[PDB]
């Protein structure tokens, strides 16, 4: 499973490539899910938070 | 074939459609519409559209790509 | 009837052509150039169709 | 027994056939109508009962043959106009 | 050996409806499935039947093919007289045309590794209207062959260039990373007559008489509607006498046309009354007590 | 109505000339080619 | 074998080629063999062969040989890729009904097949409706299908 | 660690997910057509998922739309503003 | 060998008897457990299924490469009604014709625990149909073999024929357990 | 198979037919198209039952479309110049559920009624052209009109003129080809005047058919005989040298150039 | 009853035909049985998908029949994963008519759906009727004293389609379907079909009465009871009250047709005027 973990982390580095779009977390819903407002003045709903623990995020 | 041509043209009305505002009819088949994106466009009107409904300040659905009155 | 059928099939392709902007003419220029104001997008210097 | 064209029974026939006085005919039809044995209405001024429906009963083989004979006439009438509408409206028939 | 543009993908009537039903139910998810059939020759790919794959989870994209689900369904379909191999896969594109994205190209490479002539069929259940389904069949272009200066497939006929490629597909890599295979439909007499039963009313309805109270009320209302329309129709005649030819259509925009509604009211009433009269006259002899 | 419809005469105008012109229809194809050759790249 | 078409007997699954109404003393294994041993039946001369191929295979011709004593076939109905109960053969549509004549059933006669209908044959069943001399039982020889794999 | 693999694998499934445009339902036109308005954006005539209740999509309901098709995924509760959230969760100081 | 089998369990009224310890129904539950396991170990691709022989034959489980579900179904099998041997074999024959793998060989296990109430002609014609279709049915003649020894003899002899060795007519006299006679029986051999 | 049938046209040789039928019966897509066409060439005008029964019977059994395409052309040649003796076959082919066999009936009408001007045959081709389910059969129905009207060339630019502007591009292509087939080598001004707008048709293959048809009409023709030959000669060059034109529009232009100056300006096309 | 109407979608008909054409191949030509999938909306069934199940029966004996119910469960779970909202609503079989053993099969299917609906889907293209005949099992309580038995009660069946389903169907019927015929022509064709349907059904009753008359079939006394009701409902169109009302109604509709025809002629003359003005104006400038 170690090769699977390392190969998995490689796929993250491609998607975690810069630039990132700076955004502000608006909400944290349950049905675990987040609502963010991008710097392009766009409100989005994220069915999954992403690569950051939902406990470490606040509005 | 005319009925088939009429029926197959309706795919121009497939969702999603951006909502505009009918401002002025330039001629029979073209009009000036104000998209909710904030831009005024001179576009074409679908021939299968009841022009009796194109009242001033009427909400119209525009093609998401071509802004045409569909 | 045939032209009416033909116009209908070509209409589907013609409706997919992108619509035209609406602008206000500031002043005509030389070499068939015009200074226009696109409604949300400010001013442009544009060419004029041959017709 | 009577055909649907002549289902207007007088009070005299009900009185005579049922061995009851004419004045008791009306109450007899009420029981029949209330229970549901027969359907219709009573015309007291003309001393007549307008009968519109009877409880279906058991038929012999012979009466079933007669019932089928009515179907043969009924089938011909339906077929006759089926060919009539087809012939008359042939141009516009899809 | 080079593929030919004369190659055709034949989709049965059953296979077409299942992809449309599954694709529409799965809007907007790119719901995928397997196309069963038989590679008849180097120029035909028959799609006899398809079966839909489950969605592993949320996400508007094509998920990986589940081998156990594929193996179990193929094994069970063989038990009911369906011993047809998988000739490709189908997935839905709900409204943005028929093409292959980056994910779909990788998904197709999985099938092309197993079967070199596997076909990726894309169905647009949203843009498909009656009498015209937005469908397309794609197979990948090997980048090694095309970069060196070779056409992806040889052209020996006109059959491969009858359908003009769409700009939406040409934008998303058509004729660069994948090519389109012309799609024909296998329809037999039995399946056509069976589908003709759709919207076929019962024989009771033909002889059924509309309620006379509502028929008179409908006749009452519409005739009253023409009373105002006729009054407006007179005004339209005088107005159009003194109207410039540029206003024959512009001035009719947004204002109701008395002539147009008069014809519709006339057409509705004459269809309504003639049918009611004719059906009533037929019933007087058909349902006759004598 | 049938007599009036049968009396409606169409002048022998050059049909299929109100369709897309050959030169104008050629304009779209070249412009659309650059749309595919630039936006996709 | 005809040029360009091989003998497909090695291609078939020997373990998986079943027979119906076969006398135990001479069976399917002796049938495929080139030697003298045959495939006789027990219940009646009527008999149903089932042959399942390893890979998709086209059948160009067959050599369904029988002894000239009269027990050889005179009516062969061939069925392709059935999804067969000795009553279906009575009333069904054979792929190519074949009246194997005395020339066809001898040691040298080959029987041509409709190559159009024999293209994708994963499993084939051959039925012997009637023999030549109206005997109680039938007898077979090295019944082999001549053709090429689908590939 | 087995748990480490699960967290990394859950990460991979998370990466495939795509954000959804937040809007508001304005009026249900047909049984399959809706008018929605983006939070800061135009109004569209959009569709809806078959699995959705479609009775909770009353006018004014906040919804999440696909980025491509703009179809309604789900109805969301009334949005609490981040500033309003900080108003409610503001420590007085145990006075 | 690669063969598909169906067990023709008996759930008639006579299965309530204690002639086979403790109950003929309980005796056959152990017996089915042994034959179902025996076929599994012969080849892992072996298919087994369960059919009842009640007043109306009921297919409790079709062919499946599982053993627990066969004993799971036999647990709820309660004695009711009368044996119908005529229709049981045919219904079991029908399930065999619709096996998962056509390469498998026909096989039926019959647990006759009640007399077969038909003329010998019906049993004879039934065997020929199985023999034509290469269907082998191993019948265990426990219970009322004093009256069933002749009807079933016409079955196996017509089915097996001369030098058959395809269907056996093992008749176990009443004793401690009929399953104990199965491991020495040619059915599991 | 193509070489044998081309070298055995109308010979009615049993050995050639037997060998070719062996290749056709192999049910191979590539060789089936070849054998089917060659079968008609060898049995050209023979109208024998056996060739018809074997070929049409094969078409209703083969599952390969290429074999059907070759047979469709082949079946027509079997009954070439057979006048009304092909009525029984034509009605059998035209009523067929197979689109290609329906196309064979159109070709059979063309060959059985070549140059006869039979209005009954023209009535049938026009019916299929305007009312049919398959565009290929419609395109072949209009194409077959040229074979019936070449003996009277002035008549095609009147029956086909209206089909030249139809909504169906396949009928438009057929109208172009019908003018080319009927007016081949005649330099018909009326036919060329119909094809000149076709060369700018929105559909690419319609343009190709007009370009090829234009070459067939005025092969060998000079400026005096036809004033428009110089216009089309430059049009062929312009299409070929147009990097932005469709590839099959150029295919017609290139073939038009070869036909226009075929045989070193010493050959002509004339079905009569 | 528990089922008011069964709506069978065109996918099921195509699937059932394909089931019959792939099992009823060179093997045999019996009836094939599958499992119906659909949803429930108020009291109208919505049969929308189906899958085939292995099935066989004896031609002679009706009590001998096999249905792979384990196959039923395995594919249902296979189908439930793709579309959870589509549950088992019954079974189908392509038999041209009912069979004696369907009541036994429905009992097997009743375990997976208590209100199981059997839909007989005739693969043969019948000319006048729908191919679907939807039946539900009911417990008929006889009044003669005969013990209560399980019987099939007819449920009115209709062929309806989904939005995308109808899109594909119109694509497959694009060429064959003739939509040029106006509404009025279609309605009259419905009346002709209504006359044909009634004649066929009247012929079926007459054929049944013929068999009863000659003793081929026993006297039912429930059909005959119903038949008296049919003949009693036969209206008398010779009554003075009815004829006057019919004339009163017919004349009421005629004046509306006369008014609409009168308006049509005026509008037609207006069109002719515009055409002649346009024609005259075009030639004046040219
Ligand atoms: Zn995709």
Author numbering:
A (entry chain F): 69 to 99, 120 to 147
B (entry chain D): 71 to 140
C (entry chain C): 52 to 102
D (entry chain a): 283 to 376
E (entry chain c): 23 to 312
F (entry chain V): 487 to 527
G (entry chain u): 119 to 201, 204 to 271
H (entry chain E): 36 to 130
Paper text:
The redox-active thioredoxin (TRX)-like protein TXNL1 is expressed in many cell types and was proposed as a nearly stoichiometric component of the human 26S proteasome. It uses its C-terminal PITH (proteasome-interacting TRX) domain for binding, while potentially reducing disulfide bonds with its N-terminal TRX domain but how it binds and is regulated remained unclear.
In both datasets, 30 s and 2 min after substrate addition, we observed non-substrate-engaged proteasomes in the RS conformation, with Rpt3 at the top of the staircase, Rpt2 at the bottom and Rpt6 as the seam subunit bound to ADP, while all other subunits were ATP bound. Interestingly, although our cryo-EM dataset showed a higher number of RS proteasomes, TXNL1’s tail was not detected interacting with Rpn11, likely because of its incompatibility with Rpn11’s Ins-1 loop in the open state. Local refinement of the PITH domain and 3D variability analyses for both RS.1 and RS.2 allowed us to separate two major PITH domain states that we term forward (49.8 % of particles) and backward (40.5% of particles) according to the PITH domain rotation, along with a smaller number of particles showing the PITH domain in intermediate positions. In the RS proteasome, TXNL1’s PITH domain makes transient ionic contacts with Rpn2 and Rpn10, yielding low-affinity binding with at least two orientations above Rpn11 that may allow dynamic association and dissociation.
